[PDB]
Design an enzyme around this catalytic site. Structure first.
Site, PDB file in Angstrom:
ATOM      1  N   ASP A  23       0.795  -1.198   0.000  1.00 35.22           N
ATOM      2  CA  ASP A  23       0.000   0.000   0.000  1.00 35.22           C
ATOM      3  C   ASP A  23       0.832   1.253   0.000  1.00 35.22           C
ATOM      4  O   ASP A  23       0.738   2.069   0.925  1.00 35.22           O
ATOM      5  CB  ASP A  23      -0.901   0.009   1.244  1.00 35.22           C
ATOM      6  CG  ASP A  23      -2.058   0.969   1.126  1.00 35.22           C
ATOM      7  OD1 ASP A  23      -2.718   0.974   0.063  1.00 35.22           O
ATOM      8  OD2 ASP A  23      -2.308   1.707   2.106  1.00 35.22           O
ATOM      9  N   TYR A  27       0.680   3.092  -7.008  1.00 37.37           N
ATOM     10  CA  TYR A  27       0.802   1.863  -7.788  1.00 37.37           C
ATOM     11  C   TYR A  27       1.191   0.609  -7.021  1.00 37.37           C
ATOM     12  O   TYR A  27       0.727  -0.486  -7.339  1.00 37.37           O
ATOM     13  CB  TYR A  27       1.787   2.078  -8.928  1.00 37.37           C
ATOM     14  CG  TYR A  27       1.229   2.916 -10.053  1.00 37.37           C
ATOM     15  CD1 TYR A  27       0.760   2.321 -11.223  1.00 37.37           C
ATOM     16  CD2 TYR A  27       1.163   4.306  -9.947  1.00 37.37           C
ATOM     17  CE1 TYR A  27       0.240   3.090 -12.264  1.00 37.37           C
ATOM     18  CE2 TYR A  27       0.644   5.086 -10.977  1.00 37.37           C
ATOM     19  CZ  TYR A  27       0.186   4.473 -12.133  1.00 37.37           C
ATOM     20  OH  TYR A  27      -0.322   5.233 -13.160  1.00 37.37           O
ATOM     21  N   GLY A  29       0.525  -1.892  -5.226  1.00 33.74           N
ATOM     22  CA  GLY A  29      -0.724  -2.479  -4.711  1.00 33.74           C
ATOM     23  C   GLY A  29      -1.661  -2.933  -5.837  1.00 33.74           C
ATOM     24  O   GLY A  29      -2.072  -4.088  -5.839  1.00 33.74           O
ATOM     25  N   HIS A  46       7.055  -2.431 -12.926  1.00 39.46           N
ATOM     26  CA  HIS A  46       6.802  -3.836 -12.576  1.00 39.46           C
ATOM     27  C   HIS A  46       5.482  -4.313 -13.162  1.00 39.46           C
ATOM     28  O   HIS A  46       5.420  -5.363 -13.803  1.00 39.46           O
ATOM     29  CB  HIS A  46       6.752  -4.054 -11.052  1.00 39.46           C
ATOM     30  CG  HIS A  46       6.550  -5.478 -10.663  1.00 39.46           C
ATOM     31  ND1 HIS A  46       5.624  -5.880  -9.730  1.00 39.46           N
ATOM     32  CD2 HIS A  46       7.143  -6.620 -11.118  1.00 39.46           C
ATOM     33  CE1 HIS A  46       5.647  -7.200  -9.623  1.00 39.46           C
ATOM     34  NE2 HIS A  46       6.562  -7.664 -10.458  1.00 39.46           N
ATOM     35  N   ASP A  47       4.420  -3.554 -12.912  1.00 44.97           N
ATOM     36  CA  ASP A  47       3.110  -3.926 -13.422  1.00 44.97           C
ATOM     37  C   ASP A  47       3.162  -3.975 -14.950  1.00 44.97           C
ATOM     38  O   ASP A  47       2.635  -4.899 -15.567  1.00 44.97           O
ATOM     39  CB  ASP A  47       2.044  -2.944 -12.929  1.00 44.97           C
ATOM     40  CG  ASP A  47       2.020  -2.824 -11.409  1.00 44.97           C
ATOM     41  OD1 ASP A  47       2.241  -3.849 -10.721  1.00 44.97           O
ATOM     42  OD2 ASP A  47       1.771  -1.707 -10.904  1.00 44.97           O
ATOM     43  N   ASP A  92      10.208  -9.571 -11.586  1.00 44.81           N
ATOM     44  CA  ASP A  92      10.294  -9.538 -10.129  1.00 44.81           C
ATOM     45  C   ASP A  92      11.657  -9.174  -9.562  1.00 44.81           C
ATOM     46  O   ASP A  92      11.737  -8.412  -8.594  1.00 44.81           O
ATOM     47  CB  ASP A  92       9.838 -10.882  -9.526  1.00 44.81           C
ATOM     48  CG  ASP A  92       8.382 -11.209  -9.841  1.00 44.81           C
ATOM     49  OD1 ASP A  92       7.573 -10.267 -10.002  1.00 44.81           O
ATOM     50  OD2 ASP A  92       8.043 -12.411  -9.916  1.00 44.81           O
TER      51      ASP A  92
HETATM   52 ZN    ZN Z   1      -4.386   2.289   1.598  1.00 44.04          ZN
END
Ligand code: ZN
Ligand code: NAG
Ligand code: ZN
Lengths: 118, 118
Positions: A23, A27, A29, A46-47, A92
């Site tokens: 969190d 991003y 999360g 990464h995403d 990763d």
């Molecule tokens: Zn939050």
């Protein structure tokens, strides 16, 4: 997979857990809005890397198990990894390496996304 | 897809911005831990729902565009949907309906995930 990524993260940043990144910013999360800092950027990419690997066939990032190794803060993806495993694994380890180098700002953790990520 | 799911939500819960569900409890934004309440469990069932849909080859739940109709609290997934799209649509629809029946606790928004879901 994500279980292996969670641990990759600890290899490079042992003083922390993946949760510090679960969190963070806009991003680390899920995904949306304008990056907040270097760290929040490491997560953007990464995403992106993942959605690029999703383009490999039958390749599922969060679920394909790869063969990697952690040796004193340094990660290594092994060779016996299928085209899909190898791509994800790399995603990763690059993310993990990017997290260790970027600054961690407490101020950008647990932020109200509805006001900073439009 | 994400955009369609966002509409179902505004459909069943007009009195709220879909952002009110982008970071609520431990699951709305999809993670792990002890559901904080009925609404959070709604999201818990939704993530697991997406996870099962992912087992259908080539099915990307965050992106699969499906056919649905959202008419004043009324949600209908259309038959013209294939297995992947049909499954995804029922996930979002049921989650949208679920949100509509669960109280929304302002306390449970943007909670500390590291400390509360770990
Ligand atoms: Zn939050
Ligand atoms: C834009 C959007 O609706 N994103 C949904 C979010 O609303 C939901 O709370 C969460 C968890 O189940 O899953 C996301 O994909
Ligand atoms: Zn109609």
């Amino acid at each position: 997979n994500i279980k292996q990524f969670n641990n990759m993260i600890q290899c490079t940043v042992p003083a922390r857990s993946w949760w510090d990144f679960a969190d963070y910013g806009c991003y680390c999360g899920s995904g949306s809005g304008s990056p907040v800092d270097d760290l929040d950027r490491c997560c953007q990419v990464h995403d992106n890397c993942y959605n690029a690997g999703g383009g490999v066939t039958g390749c599922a990032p969060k679920s394909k198990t790869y063969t990697y190794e952690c040796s004193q803060g340094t990660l290594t993806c092994s060779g016996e990894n299928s085209a899909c495993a190898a791509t994800v694994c790399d995603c990763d380890r690059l993310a993990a390496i990017c997290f260790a180098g970027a600054p961690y700002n407490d101020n950008n953790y647990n932020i109200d996304l509805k006001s900073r990520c439009q | 897809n994400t955009y369609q799911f966002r509409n179902m939500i505004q459909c069943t819960v007009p009195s709220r911005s879909w952002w009110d569900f982008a970071d609520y409890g431990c699951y709305c934004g999809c993670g792990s831990g002890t559901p904080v309440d009925d609404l959070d469990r709604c999201c818990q069932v939704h993530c697991n729902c997406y996870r099962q849909a992912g087992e259908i080859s080539g099915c990307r739940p965050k992106f699969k565009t499906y056919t649905y109709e959202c008419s004043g609290g009324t949600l209908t997934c259309k038959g013209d949907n294939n297995a992947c799209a049909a499954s995804s649509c029922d996930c979002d629809r049921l989650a949208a309906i679920c949100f509509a029946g669960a109280p929304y606790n302002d306390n449970n928004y943007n909670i500390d995930l590291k400390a509360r879901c770990n």
